Amino acid sequence: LSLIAAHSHITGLGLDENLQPRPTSEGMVGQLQARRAAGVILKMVQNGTIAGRAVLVAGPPSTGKTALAMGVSQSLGKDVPFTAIAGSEIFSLELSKTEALTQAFRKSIGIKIKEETELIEGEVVEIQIDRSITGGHKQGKLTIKTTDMETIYELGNKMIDGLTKEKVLAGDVISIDKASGKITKLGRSFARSRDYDAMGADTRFVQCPEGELQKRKTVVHTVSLHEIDVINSRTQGFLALFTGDTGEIRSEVRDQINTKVAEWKEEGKAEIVPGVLFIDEVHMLDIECFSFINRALEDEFAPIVMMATNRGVSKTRGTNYKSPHGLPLDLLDRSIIITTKSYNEQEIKTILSIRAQEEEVELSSDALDLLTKTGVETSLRYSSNLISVAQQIAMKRKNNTVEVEDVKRAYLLFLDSARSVKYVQENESQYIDDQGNVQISIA
Amino acid sequence: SLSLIAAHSHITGLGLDENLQPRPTSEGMVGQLQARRAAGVILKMVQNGTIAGRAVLVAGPPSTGKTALAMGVSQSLGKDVPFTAIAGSEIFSLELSKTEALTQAFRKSIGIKIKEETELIEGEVVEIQIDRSIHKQGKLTIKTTDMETIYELGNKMIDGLTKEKVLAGDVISIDKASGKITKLGRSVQCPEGELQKRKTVVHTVSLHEIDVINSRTQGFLALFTGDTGEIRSEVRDQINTKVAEWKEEGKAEIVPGVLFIDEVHMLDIECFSFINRALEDEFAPIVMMATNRGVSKTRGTNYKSPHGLPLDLLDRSIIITTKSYNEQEIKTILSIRAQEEEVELSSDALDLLTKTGVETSLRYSSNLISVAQQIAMKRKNNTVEVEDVKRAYLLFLDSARSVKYVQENESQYIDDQGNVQISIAK
Amino acid sequence: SRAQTKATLASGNFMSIVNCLMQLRKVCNHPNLFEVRPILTSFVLEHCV
Amino acid sequence: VTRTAAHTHIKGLGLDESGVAKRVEGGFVGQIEAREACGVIVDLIKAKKMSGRAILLAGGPSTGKTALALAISQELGPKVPFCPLVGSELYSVEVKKTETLMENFRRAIGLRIKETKEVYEGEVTELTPEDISHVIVGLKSAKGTKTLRLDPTIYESIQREKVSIGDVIYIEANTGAVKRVGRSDAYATEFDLETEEYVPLPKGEVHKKKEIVQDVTLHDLDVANARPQGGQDVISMMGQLLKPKKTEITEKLRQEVNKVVAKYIDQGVAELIPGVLFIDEVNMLDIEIFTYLNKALESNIAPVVVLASNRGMTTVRGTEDVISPHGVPPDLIDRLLIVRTLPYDKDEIRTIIERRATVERLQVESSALDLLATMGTETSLRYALQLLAPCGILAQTSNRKEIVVNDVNEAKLLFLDAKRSTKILE
Amino acid sequence: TRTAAHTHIKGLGLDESGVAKRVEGGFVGQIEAREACGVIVDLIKAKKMSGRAILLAGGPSTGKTALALAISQELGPKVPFCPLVGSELYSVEVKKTETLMENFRRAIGLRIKETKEVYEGEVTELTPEDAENPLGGYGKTISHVIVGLKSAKGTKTLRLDPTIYESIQREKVSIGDVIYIEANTGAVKRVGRSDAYATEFDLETEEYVPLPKGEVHKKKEIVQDVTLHDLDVANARPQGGQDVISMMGQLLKPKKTEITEKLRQEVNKVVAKYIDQGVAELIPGVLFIDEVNMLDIEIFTYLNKALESNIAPVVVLASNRGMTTVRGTEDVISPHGVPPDLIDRLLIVRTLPYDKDEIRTIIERRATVERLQVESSALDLLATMGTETSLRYALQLLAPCGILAQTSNRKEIVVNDVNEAKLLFLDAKRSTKILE
Numbered sequence A: 001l002s003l004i005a006a007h008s009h010i011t012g013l014g015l016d017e018n019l020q021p022r023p024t025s026e027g028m029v030g031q032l033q034a035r036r037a038a039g040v041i042l043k044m045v046q047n048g049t050i051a052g053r054a055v056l057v058a059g060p061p062s063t064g065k066t067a068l069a070m071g072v073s074q075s076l077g078k079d080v081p082f083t084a085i086a087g088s089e090i091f092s093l094e095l096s097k098t099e100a101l102t103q104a105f106r107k108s109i110g111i112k113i114k115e116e117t118e119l120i121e122g123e124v125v126e127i128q129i130d131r132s133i134t135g136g137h138k139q140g141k142l143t144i145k146t147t148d149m150e151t152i153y154e155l156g157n158k159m160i161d162g163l164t165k166e167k168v169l170a171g172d173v174i175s176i177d178k179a180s181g182k183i184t185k186l187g188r189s190f191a192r193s194r195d196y197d198a199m200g201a202d203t204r205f206v207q208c209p210e211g212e213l214q215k216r217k218t219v220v221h222t223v224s225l226h227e228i229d230v231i232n233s234r235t236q237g238f239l240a241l242f243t244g245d246t247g248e249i250r251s252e253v254r255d256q257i258n259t260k261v262a263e264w265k266e267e268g269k270a271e272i273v274p275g276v277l278f279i280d281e282v283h284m285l286d287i288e289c290f291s292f293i294n295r296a297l298e299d300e301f302a303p304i305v306m307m308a309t310n311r312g313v314s315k316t317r318g319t320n321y322k323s324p325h326g327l328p329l330d331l332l333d334r335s336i337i338i339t340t341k342s343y344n345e346q347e348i349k350t351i352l353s354i355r356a357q358e359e360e361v362e363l364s365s366d367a368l369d370l371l372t373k374t375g376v377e378t379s380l381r382y383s384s385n386l387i388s389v390a391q392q393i394a395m396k397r398k399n400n401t402v403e404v405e406d407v408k409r410a411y412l413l414f415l416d417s418a419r420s421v422k423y424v425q426e427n428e429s430q431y432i433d434d435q436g437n438v439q440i441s442i443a
Numbered sequence B: 001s002l003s004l005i006a007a008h009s010h011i012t013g014l015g016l017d018e019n020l021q022p023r024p025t026s027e028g029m030v031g032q033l034q035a036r037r038a039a040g041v042i043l044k045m046v047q048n049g050t051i052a053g054r055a056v057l058v059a060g061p062p063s064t065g066k067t068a069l070a071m072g073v074s075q076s077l078g079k080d081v082p083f084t085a086i087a088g089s090e091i092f093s094l095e096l097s098k099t100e101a102l103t104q105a106f107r108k109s110i111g112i113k114i115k116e117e118t119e120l121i122e123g124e125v126v127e128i129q130i131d132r133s134i135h136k137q138g139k140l141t142i143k144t145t146d147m148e149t150i151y152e153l154g155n156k157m158i159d160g161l162t163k164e165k166v167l168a169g170d171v172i173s174i175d176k177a178s179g180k181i182t183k184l185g186r187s188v189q190c191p192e193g194e195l196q197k198r199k200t201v202v203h204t205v206s207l208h209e210i211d212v213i214n215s216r217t218q219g220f221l222a223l224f225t226g227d228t229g230e231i232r233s234e235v236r237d238q239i240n241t242k243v244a245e246w247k248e249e250g251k252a253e254i255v256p257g258v259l260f261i262d263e264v265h266m267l268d269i270e271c272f273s274f275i276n277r278a279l280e281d282e283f284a285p286i287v288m289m290a291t292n293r294g295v296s297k298t299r300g301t302n303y304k305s306p307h308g309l310p311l312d313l314l315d316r317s318i319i320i321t322t323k324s325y326n327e328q329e330i331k332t333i334l335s336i337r338a339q340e341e342e343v344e345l346s347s348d349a350l351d352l353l354t355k356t357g358v359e360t361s362l363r364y365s366s367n368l369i370s371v372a373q374q375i376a377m378k379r380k381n382n383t384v385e386v387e388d389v390k391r392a393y394l395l396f397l398d399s400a401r402s403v404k405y406v407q408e409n410e411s412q413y414i415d416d417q418g419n420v421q422i423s424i425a426k
Numbered sequence C: 001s002r003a004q005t006k007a008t009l010a011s012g013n014f015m016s017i018v019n020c021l022m023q024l025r026k027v028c029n030h031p032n033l034f035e036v037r038p039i040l041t042s043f044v045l046e047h048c049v
Numbered sequence D: 001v002t003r004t005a006a007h008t009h010i011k012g013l014g015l016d017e018s019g020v021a022k023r024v025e026g027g028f029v030g031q032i033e034a035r036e037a038c039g040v041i042v043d044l045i046k047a048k049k050m051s052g053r054a055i056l057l058a059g060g061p062s063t064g065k066t067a068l069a070l071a072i073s074q075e076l077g078p079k080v081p082f083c084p085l086v087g088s089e090l091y092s093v094e095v096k097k098t099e100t101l102m103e104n105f106r107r108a109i110g111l112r113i114k115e116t117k118e119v120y121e122g123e124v125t126e127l128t129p130e131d132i133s134h135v136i137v138g139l140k141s142a143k144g145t146k147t148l149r150l151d152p153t154i155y156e157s158i159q160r161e162k163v164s165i166g167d168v169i170y171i172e173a174n175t176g177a178v179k180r181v182g183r184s185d186a187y188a189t190e191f192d193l194e195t196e197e198y199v200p201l202p203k204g205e206v207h208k209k210k211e212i213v214q215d216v217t218l219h220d221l222d223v224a225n226a227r228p229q230g231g232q233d234v235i236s237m238m239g240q241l242l243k244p245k246k247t248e249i250t251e252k253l254r255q256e257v258n259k260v261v262a263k264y265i266d267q268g269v270a271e272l273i274p275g276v277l278f279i280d281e282v283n284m285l286d287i288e289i290f291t292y293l294n295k296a297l298e299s300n301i302a303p304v305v306v307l308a309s310n311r312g313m314t315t316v317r318g319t320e321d322v323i324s325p326h327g328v329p330p331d332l333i334d335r336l337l338i339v340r341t342l343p344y345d346k347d348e349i350r351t352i353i354e355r356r357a358t359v360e361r362l363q364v365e366s367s368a369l370d371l372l373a374t375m376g377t378e379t380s381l382r383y384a385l386q387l388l389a390p391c392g393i394l395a396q397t398s399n400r401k402e403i404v405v406n407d408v409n410e411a412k413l414l415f416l417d418a419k420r421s422t423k424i425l426e
Numbered sequence E: 001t002r003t004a005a006h007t008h009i010k011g012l013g014l015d016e017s018g019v020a021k022r023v024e025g026g027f028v029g030q031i032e033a034r035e036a037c038g039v040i041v042d043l044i045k046a047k048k049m050s051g052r053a054i055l056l057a058g059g060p061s062t063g064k065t066a067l068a069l070a071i072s073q074e075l076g077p078k079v080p081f082c083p084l085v086g087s088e089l090y091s092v093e094v095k096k097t098e099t100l101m102e103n104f105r106r107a108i109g110l111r112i113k114e115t116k117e118v119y120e121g122e123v124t125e126l127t128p129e130d131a132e133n134p135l136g137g138y139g140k141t142i143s144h145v146i147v148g149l150k151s152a153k154g155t156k157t158l159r160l161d162p163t164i165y166e167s168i169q170r171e172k173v174s175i176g177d178v179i180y181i182e183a184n185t186g187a188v189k190r191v192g193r194s195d196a197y198a199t200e201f202d203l204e205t206e207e208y209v210p211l212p213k214g215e216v217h218k219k220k221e222i223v224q225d226v227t228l229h230d231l232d233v234a235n236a237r238p239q240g241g242q243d244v245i246s247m248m249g250q251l252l253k254p255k256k257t258e259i260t261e262k263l264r265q266e267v268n269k270v271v272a273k274y275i276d277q278g279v280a281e282l283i284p285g286v287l288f289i290d291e292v293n294m295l296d297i298e299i300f301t302y303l304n305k306a307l308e309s310n311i312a313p314v315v316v317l318a319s320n321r322g323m324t325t326v327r328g329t330e331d332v333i334s335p336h337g338v339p340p341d342l343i344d345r346l347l348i349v350r351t352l353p354y355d356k357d358e359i360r361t362i363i364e365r366r367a368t369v370e371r372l373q374v375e376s377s378a379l380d381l382l383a384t385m386g387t388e389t390s391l392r393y394a395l396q397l398l399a400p401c402g403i404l405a406q407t408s409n410r411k412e413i414v415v416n417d418v419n420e421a422k423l424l425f426l427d428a429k430r431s432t433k434i435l436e
């Protein structure tokens, strides 16, 4: 379940075997130095040895830094946790800011435990269940077949109860798990003898299973560290895993959990898969948060943190002095900064073509040039938004291609920041100013 | 109450004579003659109990024994009398209003002694017959030092002894009224007289404790958990009127105590406004206040104040001022501190420590004594020599030397504007 | 570490050393032989305050 | 194979028996005077005599304060409690900052006790109720058989655990916990297909008794005495799901816990292990936290708290006109001993880089290592430290093991420093 | 007995015609203020007007709290009087407006009388009977129960409903137990075992109680004073219910909640109905707000709105500052720290400072009530000290002088004792000078 989002066009970093960024691949365009740095960080993360490094992504708005993070996440792929949060999420009311940050960090450490399970899988030949009226004793036995073997089993009380709950019928194909005891109906073998109800709802036949009737299979349990913390924090913590409201979990629990996980790793019971945490608009964070971040990176079970910021020199929140990137020098000294540059014209034109391809919008060459010129003049995001509006205008025109006139109409109807600013400056009397004065009447 | 060695453990009293004239060095307290005199006058006023709602301020330079004086007063007052010492930063809570916290603090220092006479049998034990319905027939025998006699039980006593599963040949205490049964070890010990004794037990509680006890269905848990919540004012009024009635009846006596706020400079103007009225009412204890800052802006206000307190409170208080210690007083206080910490200093070492404490701070030398003792322990020496004190001085810094070090290299530290020179080069 | 073990070793009673070796081998083979892993549970206070 | 962090190479202080520190031991380079002071402090802590002692590690950034703290923690050993903190952690939302600070204080004081565990483990043979009524259950073990009478709470646990006759059960007498360990092996062939898990009949006698040693803290006891924490009864479930948030533990509960611990020590069943509390970013603490920390340092039962700060002549948070040596008000400064930590020259930076490379399993050419050291001298040591991993990644991409100069230059061109970014912004 | 700051104040000290004697009821001076307080006390005793407000305005240590407590004493224990301070309004559980509303209603007392009939005594017989026909009822078919009670004046045989029998079974009552039955509600209470059967068993845990005095069936008329806030609390947090949910709610802390206006409306309706029948009467009391300067602007505005209610006590205010900015506002300088709109609703009672003679008389009275004897010369020294620095300083300095005199085993305080007390304890001006 997904829709075409602002970063839906990028499927990775698009790098070669020698970490040399391809000029355009996997959706990403240009930004070669930053993509190379991202690839180096990617290899460091995939190695899994370096812990608690902090990396900062800096540069002007719209220069793809959040796209760079999305590409990094796509390169990580599944089975490696990636927690993307914003600075605005940290300031909560039910948790201390350091508690919220701790919960965020522990969401970024993944534990994989592999287990081997014995599985029975069959076609049902017949099932029998002898239960005494006004009595609790029940007797049953099951016959279950495979293409190469058939066997009978005599059923215990719990197995009888489970099979009765599942309403197994002989024309079912089903698997039996000897440990869990759950029964899953895989499909149907033949028809229901044409009873006068449920006539043709079983047409989707399934093939008989083949091989040993009782076969061993492996199951992998992927769980984050934060989930384990919530599970072991209190008795009601499992409900809190979905409801929230976990409370401010005691630190001693965290210390014991860290020791236990360290023992599990050294024992080979569990495999730890650290991931990457991405913070958006970090400058929103408080100096108390950055103070906690300084120590939090030093921990051995910490992920690798990447921070997006663009405000340049600005007053750090909680203090009365400006700081080089909105962040204190305490955090700035311990972090490696990767930079992003403004885009050339050709990079913008190819980004626009890629976005139109992703949105399934067919742009004519002259229309593509006009849209690129508009994007170069004002902003890449503005032209990106204009693409879909032009497509809708073309559809309204009953044409299968987007022409230049559609783009012109979209420009005329919908404004950019500069045009709105100019129209405001010309007509300041029609809007409410900071001093609370405005003319509502026209005479 | 087993605990390690603190910085005030030596203070075993206020060191007063019969004529309230303090001796030069007694009960841990050196000098501070007028301060100790005033503290003793306050102590006698508290013991008399005829004066309520008096606030005393302790004044003069920081590190001049204001807390040491208050501790001396608390210890000289002894037990069986409340003495609450709370920091001003404990008042501000997210679950209790500041006014509610101050009210609880005032009431916690007023104690009420209520006598309960209970009939309890204390005896060494002899064999017990319990029988089924013939509701239940049972007999027990108790031995003491001079009697051995059979009691015939009833239904509830039989039920209680079955629940307790009391053995024989051991020692058991049973209360006739309450019905509680307390087990004791085998006879080291032995019953000492009559089987059934009439001894009263005295219970010491405060007004706050009574308020919490009547506050809820099971409010007595709040006396430990601390989640009392804002108690209704009618509940407190009921407690007040019932305590007045009990005192009139003569079945309970009131023991007024002392409330100590160690850091009054943290309460805001609202707290002072409430405190002004809390002193006036009856059942108000005596409040001891300590402040070190001369003239500052009161928290919650935008103007300075003569002691950090509004003049309305200053009109209601009497101020005790402390002189700074001289070199001789410093020397003898360091001698007492070293004796308490089990450190054998030399004479020249003691003189050097005295001069060091006079130059920088008494606390600094007091903390340096243990460091010097540990340094000497590394050299396998019993007596602390001069070189140990010099090494302790060199390795651990005082405030002024650290300030000088920071001042001369302010570039490598973070300044108020957030600038720092991390680069060792250039 | 156990001082009595050291003393036993010092004794030089060939039997005693053989037994010690046997205990070592048992410990190495599976800890359950030497001491079952104790099932950890909370400390119990005799009575609340 | 293994993961690496900021302080993976820090194994200890490397101090000799006499206390003097070699130039290079325990992974430390230089800072000999601070190491000697820290060793003296370690001796002071190990004495287990004083309480509430506080020291301040004052120095610039990237100078070795956290490294010293972690080295002290390692050298003391896992037996003692060492609790690192940032001041930001104290600013809780559920309870006041005082409650969090006091909880951290008592969490840093350790208690080691001896407890006897009574264990029963059996397969079940009879289930009879004494009629909520006591239950009668028979149990066998490889050495024999026994029948037990269990309290109604245990009966509820067994009923809610879906125990059948012929199930194997584990009962811990101290907690009254019933765990179904599985189905007996003797019934393995009872069916062909059931969800049963078969376990073998327990070895030995039904009743076993063993003596363990378990480590607890004062905070753990406080939590135990404050709220229900375990149990398999619905009563326990309701008791623990009620009042879920933290509460302001009262001074009375702490006093009672102290009295209990003193009784345990006197009986010899418990021993005390005073530990260390470390607070970092102390400048984050507001004036209220410092004001209460003044009170806690005078407490008779407190750990050896160490403070790290790296700001000079900065205003105290909360206050508007208090200029202090390190953001610490003069009241707390007099309670502290200041340990100065000094910056690093070029040679020590080079040695540190070499050791870090050796620890992280990297191979560095002498010229490349010289270039990295001189560029760290130019900008910052930590900059060189974090560049090591990208350099190692770059070397692997070239199918080359040892790091060469080209990788270092490429890494510098790819990743920039804070000063370079600030220049770019300008 | 303990001696508070306002212990010596025994009354307003007024004549039948309203004139106040120069020295009566512990008061010294303040003739005009005392007369105004007498008029206000008459207005309160009239019990006709609602929402009237007056303000006791004067400097620190002038007698605002003294006048408030004198008014409380003069009104008597049958008139509500809720003391308060301005800082207590800032709650953390509910808005300050709700706390002001709650306290404001506390000062409207209601006196409700109820006649109750109770059956009490020692049980002698208990013979449950079934219905005359088995078809008469369902299941057990238990009919009335007959109980015999014994009192100091005789015995009576009662016929009880099966519900009362169920209550008896619930309370676990046996023969000889002293019981207590309320015909008003059908509630049975088990007082205990009779003292007659105290020595039946030589070891038994039973609360033996004496045989009830008077008749077995005594009818009494009960009169109690209950506040409107009490009814509001009873409706908001009822104590009824014996379910597990009820017990779990009982264990919860009684946090204040914003009681809706609808509940007050219903309470007002029911109280009006019962007063209409004549059973109960309404007694508007007095609400005292000390240090009105500390209130926020929102609290002042809600005070403005509260005075427009139909039921409202006479709020008396104290302020010791003038031309002071109102808290919660940046620019509004106001006469007494009270917003100008609220001042327009107030009546200011000006209180004037004292001279040397009044201070001398006050010191005399304070020393008398303190069980301390003071010499005339030492008393003149104390009066000069008080007029030099402050009266309250001397009034508090009486006690250390007495303690010092006792330490010298002297019956009366001497001038040397006053000098030594001066040396031991300083004042605000002297402390400020010594700190400079």
Ligand SMILES: Nc1ncnc2c1ncn2[C@@H]1O[C@H](COP(=O)(O)OP(=O)(O)O)[C@@H](O)[C@H]1O
Residues within 6 Å of the ligand: A006, A007, A010, A027, A028, A029, A030, A031, A060, A061, A062, A063, A064, A065, A066, A067, A068, A351, A380, A381
């Ligand atoms: N180098 C790039 N390659 C492909 N798409 C890009 C690139 N840079 C930016 N974009 C796209 O342009 C839009 C704006 O980039 P964005 O990441 O929002 O910039 P910023 O992170 O500075 O806000 C997004 O849709 C993003 O995917």
Ligand SMILES: Nc1ncnc2c1ncn2[C@@H]1O[C@H](COP(=O)(O)OP(=O)(O)O)[C@@H](O)[C@H]1O
Residues within 6 Å of the ligand: B007, B008, B028, B029, B030, B031, B032, B061, B062, B063, B064, B065, B066, B067, B068, B069, B333, B336, B362, B363, B366
């Ligand atoms: N007169 C005295 N005799 C002995 N020790 C003293 C005396 N005055 C102060 N001290 C000790 O010196 C230290 C500082 O006293 P303290 O009460 O903390 O100062 P302040 O309250 O002014 O901050 C404490 O260890 C205290 O025990």
Ligand SMILES: Nc1ncnc2c1ncn2[C@@H]1O[C@H](COP(=O)(O)OP(=O)(O)O)[C@@H](O)[C@H]1O
Residues within 6 Å of the ligand: D006, D007, D027, D028, D029, D030, D031, D059, D060, D061, D062, D063, D064, D065, D066, D067, D068, D310, D352, D382, D385
């Ligand atoms: N003397 C040293 N020897 C070896 N490594 C060091 C030394 N000082 C610092 N480091 C390394 O550099 C990091 C920075 O030290 P740190 O203690 O964080 O400085 P500070 O706490 O003063 O800001 C440490 O985490 C450690 O990995």
Ligand SMILES: Nc1ncnc2c1ncn2[C@@H]1O[C@H](COP(=O)(O)OP(=O)(O)O)[C@@H](O)[C@H]1O
Residues within 6 Å of the ligand: E005, E006, E026, E027, E028, E029, E030, E058, E059, E060, E061, E062, E063, E064, E065, E066, E067, E362
């Ligand atoms: N008219 C009076 N006659 C006798 N004593 C008085 C009189 N007025 C005030 N006092 C005494 O002096 C004190 C000052 O009055 P008080 O109300 O406390 O002043 P404030 O205005 O500060 O509240 C009172 O507590 C009382 O003990």
Ligand SMILES: [Mg+2]
Residues within 6 Å of the ligand: A062, A064, A065, A066, A067
């Ligand atoms: Mg972005």
Ligand SMILES: [Mg+2]
Residues within 6 Å of the ligand: B062, B063, B064, B065, B066, B067, B290, B292
């Ligand atoms: Mg002090």
Ligand SMILES: [Mg+2]
Residues within 6 Å of the ligand: D062, D065, D066
């Ligand atoms: Mg650091």
Ligand SMILES: [Mg+2]
Residues within 6 Å of the ligand: E060, E061, E065
């Ligand atoms: Mg007053």
